[PDB]
């Protein structure tokens, strides 16, 4: 009864995220005047969010509406690994976008000598390698012995894998994003003083607020409930803070191409 209702609003979110993240890629794959490192830092974020909304998220919706895992155990292992990998790569794409914008507004003339076509490629390599190191954590060593029932798909919640990956996958990128965007905000107030602090404060506030509002509930419920045995939350709040991190990948195409005038001229041209 309510399974079709929850499934159709979930599939609406899936189609919205897939269409948005394929529009961000199509804005660059056809418009050849977008060829810089700043545009590739949005392209790889759209690639990570498209892999999540295309390959991971239909199986998350099926797992939510059915109640059990209707595929094999190797498909469950692949799905959990690709889930952690694509979400971690999305968060680190946000982090490297933030670093690029900081050393773009702090060194405007010395930007093509400090962000070259080789160091941005190496930054993509080093964020995707660390996402892949975190996601293939429990695949050989970081796993307590799971039950052998094929119709369950349990995520890994080891204390020590949750804490380390939570730290190095949210709390260091959160601190970096906050530092670089507060310095960007300080520069954007000319380092009419009312119409300048309001616009930059609103623009950076929605950018950092969507990120924290989608990912801080998950990364606050997950390490705290894995360490303090007194705090055990409900099972509705876990699904809510689980799906908010999925919602971030559908929120991201509305924000980051609309924070670029060339992308704003290409996005409405490709749709």
């Amino acid at each position: 009864s309510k399974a079709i209702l929850l499934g159709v609003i979930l599939g609406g979110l899936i189609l919205f995220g897939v269409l948005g993240n394929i529009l961000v890629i199509l804005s660059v794959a056809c418009h050849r005047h977008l060829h810089s490192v700043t545009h590739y830092y949005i392209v790889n974020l759209a690639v990570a969010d498209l892999l999540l909304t295309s390959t991971v998220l239909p199986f998350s919706a099926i797992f939510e509406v059915l109640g059990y895992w209707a595929f094999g155990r190797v498909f469950c292992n692949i799905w959990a690994a690709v889930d952690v990998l694509c979400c971690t790569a999305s968060i680190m794409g946000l982090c490297i976008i933030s670093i690029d914008r900081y050393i773009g507004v702090s060194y405007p003339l010395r930007y093509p000598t400090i962000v070259t076509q080789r160091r941005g490629l190496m930054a993509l390599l080093c964020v995707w390698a660390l996402s892949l190191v975190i996601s293939i954590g429990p695949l050989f060593g970081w796993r307590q012995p799971a039950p052998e029932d094929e119709t369950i798909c349990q995520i890994n919640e080891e204390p020590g894998y949750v804490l380390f990956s939570a730290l190095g996958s949210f709390y260091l990128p959160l601190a970096i994003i906050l530092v670089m965007y507060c310095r960007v905000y300080v520069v954007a107030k000319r380092e009419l003083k009312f119409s300048r602090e309001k616009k930059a404060a609103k623009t950076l506030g929605i950018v950092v607020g969507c990120f924290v509002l989608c990912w801080l509930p998950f990364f606050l419920v997950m390490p705290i409930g894995s360490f303090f045995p007194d705090f055990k939350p409900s099972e509705t709040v876990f699904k809510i803070v689980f799906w908010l991190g999925y919602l971030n990948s559908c929120i991201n195409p509305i924000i980051y191409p609309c924070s670029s005038q060339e992308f704003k001229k290409a996005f409405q041209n490709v749709l």
Epitope: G67, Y68, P147, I152, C153, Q154, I155, N156, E235
Partner: nanobody, 116 residues
């Protein structure tokens, strides 16, 4: 905390019948599965049966002749094993695992022997 304590096992002739039980001494949520697994001396743990709210699952070697049942009021799970072949001689554990979170309580174990 939940301490699954299973019983009911013993010594069965070939083709006989047994009825395993697993109690809880606590509370398992209704959105959790509860199953029976089996480990032979020499091999590893294999899944045998499981009942939750979303499905009832069996292993394909015990699919026709085993029957899992659950009483959520007394928080107990029964496994009626009929027509016992001489390869079910193993240790049977009961588990109270979850579907999507790394939560698994495990029983002590009960030896079930089939001979001929």
């Amino acid at each position: 905390q939940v301490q699954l304590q299973e019983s009911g096992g013993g010594l069965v002739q070939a083709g006989g019948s047994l009825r395993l039980s697993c109690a809880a001494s606590g509370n398992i949520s209704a959105h959790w599965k509860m199953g029976w697994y089996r480990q032979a001396p020499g091999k590893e743990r294999e899944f045998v049966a499981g009942i939750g709210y979303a499905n009832t699952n069996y292993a394909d070697s015990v699919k026709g002749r085993f029957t899992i049942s659950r009483d959520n009021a007394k928080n107990t799970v029964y496994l009626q094993m009929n027509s016992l072949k001489p390869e079910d001689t193993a240790v049977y554990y009961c588990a109270a695992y979850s579907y999507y979170r790394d939560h698994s309580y495990w029983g002590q174990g009960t030896q079930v022997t089939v001979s001929s």
